[PDB]
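so ive been stuck on this for like two days lol. basically i have the seq below and the ligand is calcium ion, smiles is in there too. i just want the complex predicted, nothing fancy, no docking runs or whatever. if the output looks off dont worry ill sanity check it later, just need somthing to start from for the group meeting slides
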Amino acid sequence: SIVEWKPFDIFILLAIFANCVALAIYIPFPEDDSNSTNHNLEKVEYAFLIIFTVETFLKIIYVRNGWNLLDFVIVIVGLFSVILEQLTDVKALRAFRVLRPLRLVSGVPSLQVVLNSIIKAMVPLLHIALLVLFVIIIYAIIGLELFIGKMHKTCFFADSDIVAEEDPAPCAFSGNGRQCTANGTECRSGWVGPNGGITNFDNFAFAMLTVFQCITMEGWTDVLYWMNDAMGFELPWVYFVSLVIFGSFFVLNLVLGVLSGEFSKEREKAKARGDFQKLREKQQLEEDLKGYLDWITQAEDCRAAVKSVTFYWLVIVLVFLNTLTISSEHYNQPDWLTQIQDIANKVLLALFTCEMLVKMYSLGLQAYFVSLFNRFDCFVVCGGITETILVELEIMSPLGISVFRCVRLLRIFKVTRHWTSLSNLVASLLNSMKSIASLLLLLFLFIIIFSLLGMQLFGGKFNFDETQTKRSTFDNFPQALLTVFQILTGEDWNAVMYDGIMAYGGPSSSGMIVCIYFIILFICGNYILLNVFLAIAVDNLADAESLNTAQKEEA
Amino acid sequence: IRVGCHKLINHHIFTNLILVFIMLSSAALAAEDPIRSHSFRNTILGYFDYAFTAIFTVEILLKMTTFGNYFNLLDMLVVGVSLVSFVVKILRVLRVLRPLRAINRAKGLKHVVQCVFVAIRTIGNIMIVTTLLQFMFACIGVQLFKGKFYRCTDEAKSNPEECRGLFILYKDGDVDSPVVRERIWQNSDFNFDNVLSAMMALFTVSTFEGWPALLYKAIDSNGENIGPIYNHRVEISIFFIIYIIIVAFFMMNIFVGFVIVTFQEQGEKEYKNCELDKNQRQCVEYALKARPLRRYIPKNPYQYKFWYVVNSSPFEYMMFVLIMLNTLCLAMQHYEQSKMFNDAMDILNMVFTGVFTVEMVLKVIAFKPKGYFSDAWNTFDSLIVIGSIIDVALSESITFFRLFRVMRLVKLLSRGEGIRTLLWTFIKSFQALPYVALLIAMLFFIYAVIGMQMFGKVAMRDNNQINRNNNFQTFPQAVLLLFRCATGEAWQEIMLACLPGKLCDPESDYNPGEEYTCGSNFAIVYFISFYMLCAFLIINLFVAVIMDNFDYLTRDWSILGPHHLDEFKRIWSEYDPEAKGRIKHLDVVTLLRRIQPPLGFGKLCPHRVACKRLVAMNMPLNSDGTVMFNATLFALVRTALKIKTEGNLEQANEELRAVIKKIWKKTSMKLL
Ligand SMILES: CCCCc1oc2ccccc2c1C(=O)c1cc(I)c(OCCN(CC)CC)c(I)c1
Ligand SMILES: [Ca+2]
């Protein structure tokens, strides 16, 4: 225990990262398929489990800390799974190794404290969650009473069991909604449902799920239009438009109001210590340095013309010409337009190089690298000259032509740097880089964990349709990561939920219990997304106004 | 004469008459038929349009006669363009300016419009940066996917040189159902061919609508003029991920955060804290301006015992359990249930109906009908049970009271202390700001009328975005479509469906031969501007509501809260069936003993703290049993905090007359 201070924790962190990457490089094949990489990764997991149980046994010679309890639980679960596989559902218990990246936060107090703060911020939101649950229950009950067993009549064919539409919609339940118009089509009962039976109000679970989906703003108009086909136009619109207004718009305001108040409540708590004073003290000496540096050197160590307003307007017109040259490319552009583009590129590169050389011989080399603007300009000009010499040299560089244009596109910063009014926000966000990185890393870890869990659950199980290929799947790690990101954005998450439900048996059987994966990924994913991208916009932005007010006091 | 019509203009009813006229004229404008120019309804509304123009011209002349700014120019502009009437489509579209001149006739509407303009002006630094970054990302996307989004109708020809002629298509993937189709070298609707197309595509991505489709179209982007390849470059998704993270997640949350910060700063534009602070501006005010509550302890012990049976915690718990069971049974109804299940559920419904109809009369007997309407929640159960006893007869119109009986859950389950207060304060804030909602409604009305005039003639097809359920044919349907776009469902698909090359419905008036004319290039501007304006106005309403309750949202209950005042009022009403203003002093000992330690006195015996502090603290020198409601509260709030020594007690009253609002000749007794 004497020697385990520095290296043991580092070794365990490295082992956790290696286990995470080994899980990342695993490919879940459909129908028990595999390859050589999976065979090697099985032995890799064996070795990792051996290391983990050795560490768990050693650490005892424990349970009070929650993280140690989690480590013990996952270790004994891995031992259980290995023993069952060796002495034998079998691979269904394999999903508990996705918690290995979770314990990495334990080793990262930074991430941990941030995690503790985010978790503690959820206490005021429990009342809003209860209100949302009650509204969902009430609306589900109302849907059960009103729209029960009505999405089961689609335009069929004459004396056959073939649906007459490629994208079927319900008929009129009692002659009030939509009727078949084709000459040889009639509609009767026996239909499955609009979304394969997932979306309907003929059960409490179904009604609750569709009410939640409608509240989340995703696909509620589809349910409203299916109601409009089943029944008339007057009753369904009251149910759904009111549900949209109360279910989310009112709730979104309530959720934001509490968090904005809670975040502002942290502003008054942190002001007592004086965190803003440190930022003001650091900022108040920056303007005292620029005026005391040029004057302390220019007396003894030509430059009036380069700082004239004419030079400023000339460089502005030059950057405007560069922007126009870049933003004039389009598909099937004329060849002469291309010729003007290369001519302008060469001419403006020569002019900018000449301007830089003139500035370097009249302002000073050392004063450049002090400010971040000059070094970036040096990088841009070197990239541009490298691009030109590579293009006109013996190297074709097919793909690099487009990349190098984005390098020279960044000249607009040379004219956006003279704002001095918006620079307070830029300075604050550049000074809070450690916190920004901490929240971004926590969000990335959450995304990685849920991507691995989705890979374990729906990996290779999206091959049920047999008539098409699906793009938002959990086949490999990049695709699962993209799917998790898309669900986090909230767009078409219900489609992925429907695919996941149909991958486990559809509306029938216990395959619908897996829908709580997407409910948790949405509610607990948007909650973190709304605490990581709003903290930066409420903390470093309120300080900027306070910094502006303090600066105005001296001005 | 000049001073003759001035009295008529400045009358208390002429302005309201003209406001009613303009509102009803706008309503008439919102009732035309976009489809048929020649119709009975249009002619009837056409006769109406003459009447208002006559009235409005009369209003302009007399108003000018006595007055012989740019608001008056708008007043004449709306009337002026109408007189030119009676290309015509442009004028008809422009006549939508009718309700825009109601802003000048209302102080609140003008104030909220100026507030919106001020909020717009301060924002512009963020808009410029976001627009610049989006333009740079559009340029990068142009460099990346220039012309690479083309594809053939059949996924077998990978270049336009062989994507010609006819091909055999297999419907739904079945090999036994082939059909001949033409193959066309098509392009994506949202491509990166030029800078403007890239900007539009990135805007649609930033709205989080159809962005996975663009992502998977760009992943398959192979080359300049060749077809897609399945999962060619998955690594190109980094562009979309970075763009989304930078713009929508980051720089759009800075937008709302800075709006919130600006509203908070606006909420601190007054300095009324001469000596006190904000914490003393939410409790001392309540203590100074308040009202005793009513408990209504009855008489006639034959009724008093029944009331005590009714008014008890176990009875309330039993009603809670009964309603929970009733809803649990309500939620068990499913599709195609067994006959025994349906009969049992009906029988249990009758049982619960009987229980509730018994409990209403049981409460009325021990509570008297006159006082039944005194409590808001008590009347809620009053109007439900008769609905329950009606549907039990109509079971063997019908669904009205069947639906309305579910409200008992929220009625008897909102009796909390953190959710009920939240709902009440947010509803109060919404009622306190009814003009931002008016702005949103005006925007919806204007855009719905414009959409009816522009895209109203597009035929509804069952395989398009403009279908029987989504169209611009009638005002309610246009408003529903605009609500759908505001929620952001498929607004880009609707914009594509509103493009110029669209079929026209037969009922419209068009020359024979030109069936495909309806639809305009104005759709892009219409939809993008509507989305931006609606988003801005929605967040403006949200931040206004949030700033209206900033005191509650930063209550910091760890030091004080109005719940202490509510508990004090309830304890005051415990021994007082009615207010009666004043009470005796013998029960004041128990009143002080029945307060929480944060508000009253500590857990220790009152023989040391409360007994000494009662005489030590200044009290009105009234009789031994005459103490009023407006004095003990102030004395207790002074004891808990803001303690001042004897003799200098008038300093607090001077501060009250200098900081606190109008005393209404009520603090004369409170001074002593
Ligand atoms: C009053 C008319 C101007 C409104 C306006 O101008 C802008 C210029 C640049 C960037 C944003 C705006 C803007 C908005 O108000 C605006 C735009 C969008 I797009 C937007 O996001 C809509 C969807 N959202 C979640 C799905 C993505 C972040 C929001 I909130 C506000
Ligand atoms: Ca959507």
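Chain B touches chain A through 82 residues (CB under 8 Å). Chain B is about 60% helix and 0% strand.
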